[PDB]
Ligand binder design. Structure first.
Ligand code: CU
Ligand code: CU
Ligand code: ZN
Ligand code: ZN
Lengths: 151, 151
């Protein structure tokens, strides 16, 4: 059970690499092979809808907005950690990008199964992720910068 | 079940902060509050011995060497991932340090229990951790830069 997800930069429209998804006894491991991202920690989540298209809100374009919100099959309406249950099941560990713009550090989501991920989107945000809705909603990820649909 | 581990810089001898250890249903979470570290990803492992003292090898001083090797209660003699079983149970996700020298990103070790950690050491290395003994032993962590004994 391994899936390859192609990731595209939402602003440039160009490919930025792939993430390999694998099932193990401890959860789903996301192994990135990405480039052209800003150095530092990036919010990283499964979103509800199988699209990376834009949406609009109050007359403003939202890149990657068609993916909807964080994947939340238990209707928690809360953003949190990958190892806490009363928040979005889509909440992954943050994605690290090296000084050279590459992301290669794999991370584990203990609460997810690979089977439930088909048809959802993987999102990488501009900001980081403090795994809280304070002081900024949704961990402070802010804008969506790269996205791919899980097939 | 929460423990506070005080971490000290091995070269300067000064405190660099603490790591809080907590047990949850998915494993042990390590929540760092550290400062004065080099930006980037750092190898991060539980080592066998409850000491942060030096050792010597072939006439050279090894800072933090008294902690011995990676914690390996199943005698795997292999370095690997936090979610693979045939390698050191002490292998943790890598520790991220921000541009400002702070480490605040918590990580999960699904294979560990809090009870088994007492009396061991937590180590932070100079280099990163590719979770392999190739191309460099022990994930390329190299020198030990900060350490604390788990009480
Ligand atoms: Cu997101
Ligand atoms: Cu180590
Ligand atoms: Zn969330
Ligand atoms: Zn190891």
């Amino acid at each position: 059970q391994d899936l390859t997800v192609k990731m595209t930069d939402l602003q440039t429209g160009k490919p930025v690499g792939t993430i390999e998804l694998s099932q193990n006894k401890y959860g789903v491991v996301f192994i990135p092979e990405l480039a052209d991202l800003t150095p530092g920690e990036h919010g990283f989540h499964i979103h509800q809808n199988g699209s990376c298209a834009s949406s609009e809100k109050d007359g403003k374009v939202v890149l990657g907005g068609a993916a909807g919100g964080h994947y939340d099959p238990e209707h928690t309406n809360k953003h949190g950690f990958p190892w806490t249950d009363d928040n979005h099941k889509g909440d992954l560990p943050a994605l690290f990008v090296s000084a050279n713009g590459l992301a290669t550090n794999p991370v584990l989501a203990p609460r997810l199964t690979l089977k439930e991920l088909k048809g959802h989107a993987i999102m990488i945000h501009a900001g980081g992720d403090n795994h809280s809705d304070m002081p900024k909603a949704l961990g402070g990820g802010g804008a969506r910068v790269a996205c791919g649909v899980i097939q």
